[PDB]
Amino acid sequence: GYSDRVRSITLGNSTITTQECANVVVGYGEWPEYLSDNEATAEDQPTQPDVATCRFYTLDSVQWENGSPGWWWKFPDALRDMGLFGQNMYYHYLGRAGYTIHVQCNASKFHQGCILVVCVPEAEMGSAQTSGVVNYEHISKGEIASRFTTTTTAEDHGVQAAVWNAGMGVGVGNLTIFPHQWINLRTNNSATIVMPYVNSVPMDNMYRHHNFTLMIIPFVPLDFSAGASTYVPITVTVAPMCAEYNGLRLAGHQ
Amino acid sequence: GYSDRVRSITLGNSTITTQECANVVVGYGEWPEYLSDNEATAEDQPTQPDVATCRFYTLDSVQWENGSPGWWWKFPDALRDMGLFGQNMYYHYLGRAGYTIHVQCNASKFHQGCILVVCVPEAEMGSAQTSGVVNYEHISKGEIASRFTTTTTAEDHGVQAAVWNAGMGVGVGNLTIFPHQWINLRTNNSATIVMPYVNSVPMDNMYRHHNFTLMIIPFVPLDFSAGASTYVPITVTVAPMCAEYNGLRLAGHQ
Amino acid sequence: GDVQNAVEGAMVRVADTVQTSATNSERVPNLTAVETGHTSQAVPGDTMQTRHVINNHVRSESTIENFLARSACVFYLEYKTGTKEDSNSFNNWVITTRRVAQLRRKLEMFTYLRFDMEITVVITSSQDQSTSQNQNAPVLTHQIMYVPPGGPIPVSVDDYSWQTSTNPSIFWTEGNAPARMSIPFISIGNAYSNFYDGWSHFSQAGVYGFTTLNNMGQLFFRHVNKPNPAAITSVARIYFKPKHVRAWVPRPPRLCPYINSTNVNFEPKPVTEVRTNIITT
Amino acid sequence: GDVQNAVEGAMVRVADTVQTSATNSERVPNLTAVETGHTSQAVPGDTMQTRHVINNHVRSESTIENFLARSACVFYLEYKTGTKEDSNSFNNWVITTRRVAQLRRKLEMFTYLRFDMEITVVITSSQDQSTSQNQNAPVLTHQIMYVPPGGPIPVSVDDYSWQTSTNPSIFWTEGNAPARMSIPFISIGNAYSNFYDGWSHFSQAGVYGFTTLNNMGQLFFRHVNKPNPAAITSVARIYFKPKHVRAWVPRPPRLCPYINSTNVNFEPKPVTEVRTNIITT
Amino acid sequence: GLPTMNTPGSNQFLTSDDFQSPSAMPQFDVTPEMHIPGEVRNLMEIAEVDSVMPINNDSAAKVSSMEAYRVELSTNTNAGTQVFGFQLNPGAESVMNRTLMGEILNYYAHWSGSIKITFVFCGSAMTTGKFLLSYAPPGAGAPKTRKDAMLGTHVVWDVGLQSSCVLCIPWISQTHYRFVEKDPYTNAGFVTCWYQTSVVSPASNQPKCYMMCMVSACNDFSVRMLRDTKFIEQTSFYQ
Amino acid sequence: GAQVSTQKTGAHETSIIHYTNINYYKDAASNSANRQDFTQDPGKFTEPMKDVMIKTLPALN
Amino acid sequence: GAQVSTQKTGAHETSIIHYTNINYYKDAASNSANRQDFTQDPGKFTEPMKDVMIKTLPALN
Ligand SMILES: CCCCCCCCCCCCCCCC(=O)O
Ligand SMILES: CCCCCCCCCCCCCCCC(=O)O
Ligand SMILES: *C(=O)CCCCCCCCCCCCC
Ligand SMILES: *C(=O)CCCCCCCCCCCCC
Incomplete structure (x- = not known):
C-alpha cells in the first residue's frame, strides 16, 4: 500500500490531493504552534478562530510560459482579502500564524521545465532606482502575483525585480538556503512547504510587516513541442495554521 | 511483491492473465457453489462435469468504435454452443451454474474511452413496437453480440434497444445497482465479474430462461487522435462455475 | 430474523x-x-x-416492509343487479399486480419478492336511473369467490360454481366494515418473480416475459340479492398489502411509463428533465 | 417524565x-x-x-395536556356526488391550525409546541334537491387521503392518485363511528413553531412569518360511490386533539381578533373593557 | 363497557374461516364412538392406492367399455415398436386424469412428488417378452424412437413369474410444485412404452395378448391450493 | 404486559382505586393522553433571577 | 401465551414503553406486519469486492 508520491492534506473545510508530490518541507524543522505563556507579551486574551481562519485559500493563479521570468507573493498580506483570516487581520493590531503553502502545476510526460518554489523570510527588496525608495503597490498586489523581470529597469518606485539577483542583491542560485522545493515537470505536479512563524518578536502587525515572501522562479524554462498543449498554469493555495490575534478595535488601515 | 493490478485466473484447462485489472466483483457478495440437499427438488443424481464444463469460453468479440452504442449477451444461452457445457445444456431438462465473466479491452495511454460492464439478472426486455411482442432471434444471437441502438426503432418483434433506457424502460445510469465494473481505458484493460446463480428456483431450463444479461455500454465514447490505431476490440471470455445438471433424456429443443 | 413474527x-x-x-x-x-x-x-x-x-x-420507514406494507388499490371491477340473461349481472378479475401504475413500480424495484398479503376490498353501490329508481331496495349482500387455476368458471350470475364447496369465498353485506383476508405465499417457486427474461416454451418461444410465471387464478364477483325493479350497480375495489416481506436483487425504478399489463413494454423516454444551463442556481 | 407513557x-x-x-x-x-x-x-x-x-x-385541568387534549374542530370541507366532469365532486384541505379562532388561540399561548395528535373526522351527508331526490341511494363510502409535501395531487374525483400505493388513506362508510387516526410528531424541527419572526429568504424577504415553517401537506376528500340520479352533498369536519404534549415559552393570549389564516395580522384593539369610574363597586 | 374498536373484516362470512360458534343443541349426548375399519385421515392415502389407467383411450366406443383399461400386445411385433406414449400431466391428461390419484389431484391446484406406474402382464403364462418403460423429462420433446426413449429415465421390464414391473417416475422439476392444470411452465415430460425385444409364444397359444397399467403416488407426493373440481356440475337442485 | 395505575378520585373525609392499561399498538403515538402528570416549575417565569431573592429581606440594598 | 414488545417512541432529551401481542389465528400469514426490523447490509451492493478495499489506501497499486 501507501505510495509516498500520493498525499492528502486536510485543514478546516479543505482537502488538497496530489498524486505526484516530493515529500513536504517543514520550514526549519519546525511545525507551527500557538504562542506560549512564556514567550507572550500582549496581555489580552487572544482570539483563535481555528477552522474559520485556518483553511485552504486558493490565490489568483498565474500562467507559466517558456520565457516567463518568475513570480512572488507576500505573506500575510496576500491573504488580506481571504475570508475570515482577512477580517481578523483587519480588526486586530497584532496577529500570529504559520502556513501550509501548496503550489500546484501539472503538465505531461512530454512537457519539460523546472521551477524553484521558495519561502524567503524577511525578503526586503531593493528599489530599481537605487537613488530612490520603493513603495507598497510595487512590493505587493495582495493575492495577485507580482512578477520578476528579465529587464533591468522599472516605473517610479518599482522594485529591481531582475531575476538572477532575486529582487534583493544576492545570487538567485543561493535562494535554496530558505525553505524550498522544486516542481520539475518530469518528477512532480506540486510543492508543499509548511512554514512556521519566523520572526524576531512574538506577534506583529499583519499589514505593516510582510513576514515572508513566496518566490516561484523558473530555473529551467517551460518547454514542449509541436501542438502539445500551450496553456500550463501555476496555482498557489495556502492555509494559515495556529492563527491567533491580539489587540482588537475598529476596521483597520488608518 | 504482488502488485494488485496483476491477476491470473485458472479454471479447467484455462488461464487468463491481466496486468491492469481493478479488483474482481463477486456478484452480491456470493461465490458460486453447488445446490445443497436442503434446497434441492429434482430427486435424480446430478451430473457434474467439473473441468469439462467449467472452463474459459471466449465468445465472438466485438469492435469498439467512437459512435458504437453498446452490446448485450444472454446467459446461459450464449454458451449453448460452447463445447461440453453446450452439450450438457442440450441433453438436460434442468441445469444450474454460476460464472466467471471476463471482459477484455486494451488500447494505449493516448487512447480514451469508458465502458460499463454489467451483469443484469432477469433483464426482461421490451418490444420496440409497444403494441406487439418481441421474439428470440431479436433477443439473443447466442454467442454473438446483440447491439444496443442509438435509433428509437426496429424491425418486426425487435427489442427497443435505445441505449439510454437499457432496452428495459429504466435509466441506464442506474444499471450500476447490478454487479458491475468499468473498463476506463486510462485505468484498466479488463473487467471481471464472478456471478452466482441468481434465481427464484433451485435449477431451471438452460434454454427457456435467460438468467441474466451481460451489458457492455460505452458511457464515455471511444476516442484517439491523428493516426493512432483505429481498431480496438472488446473480447468477452466466460467460464461456468459449479455447474450441475438434472433430468437427462434425448438431444433437446423440441 | 422471522418476517412472520412481527413482534420481534x-x-x-x-x-x-x-x-x-x-x-x-x-x-x-x-x-x-x-x-x-x-x-x-x-x-x-x-x-x-x-x-x-x-x-x-x-x-x-425505508424498511422493505414499511415501504410495501401500506394497502394499495390494484384494480376495480363493476357489476349490476340482474338475471341469468344479463351478462353484466356478475363479473371477474384475473389477479395481477401489473394492472395499476403505482404499486407495480414499487414491487418492481426488486427482482424477486416473497411475502404474505392482506387483501381488503371496498365494494360500493349506486342506484341506476330508472322510472323505478324510487324503489325500496333492501340491503345488498355480495359474493367474492376465488377460483384457483384449474377450477370451474361461473358462466352466469346464477350457476353451481357459486356454491363454493372448496373454493374460498367472502359474503359481505353493505354498510359493514370492508371485507378483509390474509393470503400465504401462494407461489410454486421459492419467491415471486416480478421479471422473467425467458420463454413459456423450451423452443425459445410462446409467451415472453413475466406473464409466464405469475399465474395467480381469479376473483369472481356477484350480488347475492335477487334484482329489485330498478337496477343497482356495484363496483368492487381490490386492495393489496404485502406483509411479512422479503426482497431480492434491487433494480432501477421504472423510468418510462407502463403500457401493457401483460408485458414489460415501453417507449423510450429521456434520462432526466432538461435544464437551462450546465451551470444552474 | 414521559409524555407518551400516559399511565404514569x-x-x-x-x-x-x-x-x-x-x-x-x-x-x-x-x-x-x-x-x-x-x-x-x-x-x-x-x-x-x-x-x-x-x-x-x-x-x-390546567395541565398543558388536559388543557389542549380536548378534541377541537379545525376546519370543514364540502363535496358532491359526481363525475370526472364535475369539479365539485371532490375537494381538498391544506392542513393548518390557523384556520379557526378557538384552537388557534389555545395553541398560540405557547411559542413552541411538541405533541402527537389524534385526528377524528365527522363526515356528514345530505340529499340535494332534485326531481330525482326520491331515489334509492345506497350507503355512501368516503375516502380521505393524506398527500405529504411532494406527492401527486388528485386533479379529478377519479385519478391514479386515489390508488394510494404509499399515501395514508381512510375509507369510511356512513352510519358507522367517526373515523380516527393518531399522528406522530411530524415536524423536521425539534418542536412545532406557532410563531416565526423571520423570512423564507436569506435576503430578508419572500414570506414573512409562521407560514414558512408550518408545511404540513394536505387532505384530499371524495366519495367512493358512483353517482346516484340525484346529487348528494357531503361535508367533512376535521377534528384535532393534541395529545402527549410538551410546551415552551408562554406568550400573552391573543387580544385582537384574527384576520388571516396565512399571517399574524391584527388591527389594534383596546387593552380591556371600559368602566364607569376608577372607583367601582 | 370495555372499549372495543371493530377492525376491517368485521361481520363478513369467509367460507374458509375457523371460528367458534354457539351450538343449537346444548349438552347433546352424542352417540358413543365405535371402531369401524378403514379410516381415512388424509386424501393422499387414497392417491397412494393403485388404480388402473385407461391407456387404451382411442375411441368413445372403447372408453365406454372395459377395453379402455387393457393395452393390446402382440407376438411377432418388430423390436423398436412403440406400445404407447403421453405427457405426464397427472390430474390433467386423460390416461391418468380420472384415476384415484387423478381425482384427488382435481380438488387441488398444485401438486408435487414421484409417481409409480405398475405395468402388469395379463398375457398367457406360457408367453414371454421384454419392454422398455421410459420417462423423458421435458425440454426435448416426446421420444420418437426406442433410442430416444432409452436416453431418458427407464426400466427394461423382462416379463416372467413376477407379473408386474413398476416404472418409478422421479420428481424432476425446476420448481418445488407443479400446477394440476396443464401449464407450459410446469410441464412434466413424457412417459412412453416400447418393445425392447418382442412378445414370443409357443404353438397353440394366442398371438395377441394384453398388458395393463396401475398408477399411484409415492411417499413424497403432496397437493396444495384447494379448489372445486371441474368433474361435477348441475343446472338445478336434485330431487 | 399489563400496566396498573391509579385513578383520579378525590380528597376523602378524615383513597386508592386502580385502572388497567394495555397498549394495543406498535407506535407510542397511538397511546392515551398523558393527563396525570401534575408536575410544575413556575420558577423560570416567576423568578428568573441570577441572584436569589430572599422574601424576608429587602429587594434592594 | 401473550407476547410483550417495545413501542416505537423516539430519542428523548438527555425511553421504553411496551405493547402487547396475542396471535388469534392458526396461520402465521394472518399476523401483523414485520415493521420493527431495522436491520441492514448494504455491503453486497455497495462493496461486492473479492479483494477488500481499505479506504485509507489507494484503490489501485
Ligand atoms: C375470497 C378469497 C380470495 C383469495 C384471494 C387469493 C389471491 C391470491 C393473490 C396472489 C397475489 C400475487 C402477488 C404477485 C406479485 C408479483 O409477482 O407481481
Ligand atoms: C388519512 C391519513 C391522514 C394523516 C393526516 C396527517 C396530518 C398531519 C397533521 C399535522 C398537524 C400539525 C399541527 C401544527 C401545529 C402548529 O404549529 O400550529
Ligand atoms: C401482558 O400484556 C400480558 C397480560 C395479559 C394480557 C391479556 C391481554 C388481553 C387481550 C389481548 C389484547 C391484545 C391487544 C393486541
Ligand atoms: C397466553 O396466551 C395466555 C395469556 C392470557 C390470555 C388472555 C387472552 C385474551 C382473550 C382471549 C383471546 C383468544 C383469541 C382466540
Whole structure:
C-alpha cells in the first residue's frame, strides 16, 4: 500500500490531493504552534478562530510560459482579502500564524521545465532606482502575483525585480538556503512547504510587516513541442495554521 | 511483491492473465457453489462435469468504435454452443451454474474511452413496437453480440434497444445497482465479474430462461487522435462455475 | 430474523459523526477507482474536520416492509343487479399486480419478492336511473369467490360454481366494515418473480416475459340479492398489502411509463428533465 | 417524565396555609422591587395572621395536556356526488391550525409546541334537491387521503392518485363511528413553531412569518360511490386533539381578533373593557 | 363497557374461516364412538392406492367399455415398436386424469412428488417378452424412437413369474410444485412404452395378448391450493 | 404486559382505586393522553433571577 | 401465551414503553406486519469486492 508520491492534506473545510508530490518541507524543522505563556507579551486574551481562519485559500493563479521570468507573493498580506483570516487581520493590531503553502502545476510526460518554489523570510527588496525608495503597490498586489523581470529597469518606485539577483542583491542560485522545493515537470505536479512563524518578536502587525515572501522562479524554462498543449498554469493555495490575534478595535488601515 | 493490478485466473484447462485489472466483483457478495440437499427438488443424481464444463469460453468479440452504442449477451444461452457445457445444456431438462465473466479491452495511454460492464439478472426486455411482442432471434444471437441502438426503432418483434433506457424502460445510469465494473481505458484493460446463480428456483431450463444479461455500454465514447490505431476490440471470455445438471433424456429443443 | 413474527424487531440507528482533526499524510480516503465496481465508503470526516454528532436517527420507514406494507388499490371491477340473461349481472378479475401504475413500480424495484398479503376490498353501490329508481331496495349482500387455476368458471350470475364447496369465498353485506383476508405465499417457486427474461416454451418461444410465471387464478364477483325493479350497480375495489416481506436483487425504478399489463413494454423516454444551463442556481 | 407513557403520573397538590401569629420586626416580606423582573412569592400569612388550612386541591385541568387534549374542530370541507366532469365532486384541505379562532388561540399561548395528535373526522351527508331526490341511494363510502409535501395531487374525483400505493388513506362508510387516526410528531424541527419572526429568504424577504415553517401537506376528500340520479352533498369536519404534549415559552393570549389564516395580522384593539369610574363597586 | 374498536373484516362470512360458534343443541349426548375399519385421515392415502389407467383411450366406443383399461400386445411385433406414449400431466391428461390419484389431484391446484406406474402382464403364462418403460423429462420433446426413449429415465421390464414391473417416475422439476392444470411452465415430460425385444409364444397359444397399467403416488407426493373440481356440475337442485 | 395505575378520585373525609392499561399498538403515538402528570416549575417565569431573592429581606440594598 | 414488545417512541432529551401481542389465528400469514426490523447490509451492493478495499489506501497499486 501507501505510495509516498500520493498525499492528502486536510485543514478546516479543505482537502488538497496530489498524486505526484516530493515529500513536504517543514520550514526549519519546525511545525507551527500557538504562542506560549512564556514567550507572550500582549496581555489580552487572544482570539483563535481555528477552522474559520485556518483553511485552504486558493490565490489568483498565474500562467507559466517558456520565457516567463518568475513570480512572488507576500505573506500575510496576500491573504488580506481571504475570508475570515482577512477580517481578523483587519480588526486586530497584532496577529500570529504559520502556513501550509501548496503550489500546484501539472503538465505531461512530454512537457519539460523546472521551477524553484521558495519561502524567503524577511525578503526586503531593493528599489530599481537605487537613488530612490520603493513603495507598497510595487512590493505587493495582495493575492495577485507580482512578477520578476528579465529587464533591468522599472516605473517610479518599482522594485529591481531582475531575476538572477532575486529582487534583493544576492545570487538567485543561493535562494535554496530558505525553505524550498522544486516542481520539475518530469518528477512532480506540486510543492508543499509548511512554514512556521519566523520572526524576531512574538506577534506583529499583519499589514505593516510582510513576514515572508513566496518566490516561484523558473530555473529551467517551460518547454514542449509541436501542438502539445500551450496553456500550463501555476496555482498557489495556502492555509494559515495556529492563527491567533491580539489587540482588537475598529476596521483597520488608518 | 504482488502488485494488485496483476491477476491470473485458472479454471479447467484455462488461464487468463491481466496486468491492469481493478479488483474482481463477486456478484452480491456470493461465490458460486453447488445446490445443497436442503434446497434441492429434482430427486435424480446430478451430473457434474467439473473441468469439462467449467472452463474459459471466449465468445465472438466485438469492435469498439467512437459512435458504437453498446452490446448485450444472454446467459446461459450464449454458451449453448460452447463445447461440453453446450452439450450438457442440450441433453438436460434442468441445469444450474454460476460464472466467471471476463471482459477484455486494451488500447494505449493516448487512447480514451469508458465502458460499463454489467451483469443484469432477469433483464426482461421490451418490444420496440409497444403494441406487439418481441421474439428470440431479436433477443439473443447466442454467442454473438446483440447491439444496443442509438435509433428509437426496429424491425418486426425487435427489442427497443435505445441505449439510454437499457432496452428495459429504466435509466441506464442506474444499471450500476447490478454487479458491475468499468473498463476506463486510462485505468484498466479488463473487467471481471464472478456471478452466482441468481434465481427464484433451485435449477431451471438452460434454454427457456435467460438468467441474466451481460451489458457492455460505452458511457464515455471511444476516442484517439491523428493516426493512432483505429481498431480496438472488446473480447468477452466466460467460464461456468459449479455447474450441475438434472433430468437427462434425448438431444433437446423440441 | 422471522418476517412472520412481527413482534420481534431490531433497532439499528444511523451512524454518528466522529470528530476529525487536521491532517497532512500519505493516506487518501477520497482518492479511489470507480472502475472497481465499488462505492466509496467515505464519511465527511475524511475530507473535512468534523465535530462529534450523535445520530439517533433510525432508517425506519425505508424498511422493505414499511415501504410495501401500506394497502394499495390494484384494480376495480363493476357489476349490476340482474338475471341469468344479463351478462353484466356478475363479473371477474384475473389477479395481477401489473394492472395499476403505482404499486407495480414499487414491487418492481426488486427482482424477486416473497411475502404474505392482506387483501381488503371496498365494494360500493349506486342506484341506476330508472322510472323505478324510487324503489325500496333492501340491503345488498355480495359474493367474492376465488377460483384457483384449474377450477370451474361461473358462466352466469346464477350457476353451481357459486356454491363454493372448496373454493374460498367472502359474503359481505353493505354498510359493514370492508371485507378483509390474509393470503400465504401462494407461489410454486421459492419467491415471486416480478421479471422473467425467458420463454413459456423450451423452443425459445410462446409467451415472453413475466406473464409466464405469475399465474395467480381469479376473483369472481356477484350480488347475492335477487334484482329489485330498478337496477343497482356495484363496483368492487381490490386492495393489496404485502406483509411479512422479503426482497431480492434491487433494480432501477421504472423510468418510462407502463403500457401493457401483460408485458414489460415501453417507449423510450429521456434520462432526466432538461435544464437551462450546465451551470444552474 | 414521559409524555407518551400516559399511565404514569405525578400527584402534586396545592400549597397549604400555615398559621401566622402577630409580628413586629425588621423583616419585610411584602416590600420589594418590581424593577427586578421578579414576581413576589408572598403568601397571605406574610401580611395577615392566618389559620392552618390543608389544601388538597390539585392543579389538574390546567395541565398543558388536559388543557389542549380536548378534541377541537379545525376546519370543514364540502363535496358532491359526481363525475370526472364535475369539479365539485371532490375537494381538498391544506392542513393548518390557523384556520379557526378557538384552537388557534389555545395553541398560540405557547411559542413552541411538541405533541402527537389524534385526528377524528365527522363526515356528514345530505340529499340535494332534485326531481330525482326520491331515489334509492345506497350507503355512501368516503375516502380521505393524506398527500405529504411532494406527492401527486388528485386533479379529478377519479385519478391514479386515489390508488394510494404509499399515501395514508381512510375509507369510511356512513352510519358507522367517526373515523380516527393518531399522528406522530411530524415536524423536521425539534418542536412545532406557532410563531416565526423571520423570512423564507436569506435576503430578508419572500414570506414573512409562521407560514414558512408550518408545511404540513394536505387532505384530499371524495366519495367512493358512483353517482346516484340525484346529487348528494357531503361535508367533512376535521377534528384535532393534541395529545402527549410538551410546551415552551408562554406568550400573552391573543387580544385582537384574527384576520388571516396565512399571517399574524391584527388591527389594534383596546387593552380591556371600559368602566364607569376608577372607583367601582 | 370495555372499549372495543371493530377492525376491517368485521361481520363478513369467509367460507374458509375457523371460528367458534354457539351450538343449537346444548349438552347433546352424542352417540358413543365405535371402531369401524378403514379410516381415512388424509386424501393422499387414497392417491397412494393403485388404480388402473385407461391407456387404451382411442375411441368413445372403447372408453365406454372395459377395453379402455387393457393395452393390446402382440407376438411377432418388430423390436423398436412403440406400445404407447403421453405427457405426464397427472390430474390433467386423460390416461391418468380420472384415476384415484387423478381425482384427488382435481380438488387441488398444485401438486408435487414421484409417481409409480405398475405395468402388469395379463398375457398367457406360457408367453414371454421384454419392454422398455421410459420417462423423458421435458425440454426435448416426446421420444420418437426406442433410442430416444432409452436416453431418458427407464426400466427394461423382462416379463416372467413376477407379473408386474413398476416404472418409478422421479420428481424432476425446476420448481418445488407443479400446477394440476396443464401449464407450459410446469410441464412434466413424457412417459412412453416400447418393445425392447418382442412378445414370443409357443404353438397353440394366442398371438395377441394384453398388458395393463396401475398408477399411484409415492411417499413424497403432496397437493396444495384447494379448489372445486371441474368433474361435477348441475343446472338445478336434485330431487 | 399489563400496566396498573391509579385513578383520579378525590380528597376523602378524615383513597386508592386502580385502572388497567394495555397498549394495543406498535407506535407510542397511538397511546392515551398523558393527563396525570401534575408536575410544575413556575420558577423560570416567576423568578428568573441570577441572584436569589430572599422574601424576608429587602429587594434592594 | 401473550407476547410483550417495545413501542416505537423516539430519542428523548438527555425511553421504553411496551405493547402487547396475542396471535388469534392458526396461520402465521394472518399476523401483523414485520415493521420493527431495522436491520441492514448494504455491503453486497455497495462493496461486492473479492479483494477488500481499505479506504485509507489507494484503490489501485
Ligand atoms: C375470497 C378469497 C380470495 C383469495 C384471494 C387469493 C389471491 C391470491 C393473490 C396472489 C397475489 C400475487 C402477488 C404477485 C406479485 C408479483 O409477482 O407481481
Ligand atoms: C388519512 C391519513 C391522514 C394523516 C393526516 C396527517 C396530518 C398531519 C397533521 C399535522 C398537524 C400539525 C399541527 C401544527 C401545529 C402548529 O404549529 O400550529
Ligand atoms: C401482558 O400484556 C400480558 C397480560 C395479559 C394480557 C391479556 C391481554 C388481553 C387481550 C389481548 C389484547 C391484545 C391487544 C393486541
Ligand atoms: C397466553 O396466551 C395466555 C395469556 C392470557 C390470555 C388472555 C387472552 C385474551 C382473550 C382471549 C383471546 C383468544 C383469541 C382466540
